Design a binder for these strands. Structure first.
Lengths: 177, 168
RNA sequence: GGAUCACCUCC
């Protein structure tokens, strides 16, 4: 309680209803791995989707609460736990774009995904970032350079650029190395 | 180096005597303060140990400060609920800012004494609370720090604040 | 290929 009052860091988020299952995992294994891997304590409300992430006496990484929180959001925005675990690497961040802020929605989703997900895969390969398209958002994991490349390409597709120029754009940015 | 009259501080009870206690101030390393028995509670205190234990952490008000002699007096009774709550929020935000700054230092290869001298001190002087500096940078861009800290800190402070501090 | 994809599913 001394510790509770003077040191505990706590974060609160809310993930969509049908991702709750995924966050928990079979026998709670997924939540337990996040907890284990970040030395945090995660509390999930099965009805409302509210999640609480807090530090513990055991917590060793000062930024861990925030990393755990981000993995929770990534899972919430369509990433699988395996893919969300990328956020434990140094200097990799999660960025959530609201499609509705750019733009018809279902159509833009399909332009980002591409036939058989070819567009998503090319964006991931060329930017180096991980991309999840889900509901009204597209979420990207990577370092800021990787994020800015994927972000730009995704925005181009939303604003109506033909696929060709997007790939050429990606081709251009990679060539800057 | 010393807190101000009227400032709320986090402190640790180090010694208890019959008519008072000595506390070390957590945010002013090695600085000791006195707390008279009459400042421990709003009711009459018969035994201090009913209210204080060696090692206990406390939010307390600074009621008297003499910097030439290095005397500091504290009071526990004068702190209101709201004041306790605020100070505790403010203390937790100072732990974040410090962790954010340690991370920026590691990224840039500067030791912590430098980070303190080049970033912490000047930001504290100007915004009053380092976390607040970061909150401004998050809302209006890292450029708000330009001038207060060496330019080489901006790119990395930028990456860290943008990803970790919400705009209020 | 010529624009909807794959993996993860109640502690």
């Amino acid at each position: 309680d001394e510790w509770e009052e003077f040191f505990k860091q706590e974060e609160y988020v809310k993930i969509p209803k049908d991702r709750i299952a995924v966050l928990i995992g079979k026998k709670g294994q997924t939540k337990k791995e996040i907890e284990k891997r970040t030395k945090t304590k995660i509390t999930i409300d099965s009805e409302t989707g509210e999640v609480w992430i807090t530090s513990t006496k055991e917590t060793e990484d000062p930024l861990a609460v925030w990393k755990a929180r981000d993995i929770v959001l990534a899972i919430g925005r369509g990433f699988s736990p395996e893919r969300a675990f990328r956020l434990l690497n140094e200097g990799e961040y999660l960025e959530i774009i609201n499609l509705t802020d750019i733009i018809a929605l279902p159509r833009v989703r399909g332009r980002i995904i591409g036939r058989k997900g070819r567009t998503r895969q090319i964006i991931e390969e060329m930017s180096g970032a991980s991309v999840s398209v889900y509901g009204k958002t597209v979420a990207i994991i990577g370092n800021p350079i990787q994020i800015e490349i994927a972000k730009t390409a995704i925005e181009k597709l939303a604003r109506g650029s033909p696929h060709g120029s997007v790939y050429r754009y990606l081709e251009r940015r990679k060539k800057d190395l | 180096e010393y807190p101000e009259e009227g400032e709320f501080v986090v402190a640790t009870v180090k010694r208890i005597h019959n008519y008072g206690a000595f506390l070390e101030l957590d945010e002013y390393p090695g600085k000791e303060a006195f707390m008279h028995i009459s400042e421990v509670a709003s009711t009459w205190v018969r035994n201090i140990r009913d209210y204080l234990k060696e090692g206990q952490k406390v939010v307390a008000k600074v009621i008297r400060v003499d910097p030439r002699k290095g005397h500091i007096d504290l009071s526990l009774r004068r702190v209101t609920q709201q004041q306790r709550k605020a100070k505790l929020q403010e203390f937790k935000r100072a732990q974040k800012a410090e962790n954010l700054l340690r991370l920026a230092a590691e990224k840039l290869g500067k030791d912590f004494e430098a980070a303190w001298r080049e970033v912490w001190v000047p930001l504290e002087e100007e915004w009053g609370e380092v976390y607040a500096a970061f909150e401004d940078a998050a809302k209006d861009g890292i450029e708000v720090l330009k001038g207060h800290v060496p330019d080489e800190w901006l790119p990395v402070l930028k990456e860290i604040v943008e990803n970790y501090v919400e705009v209020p």
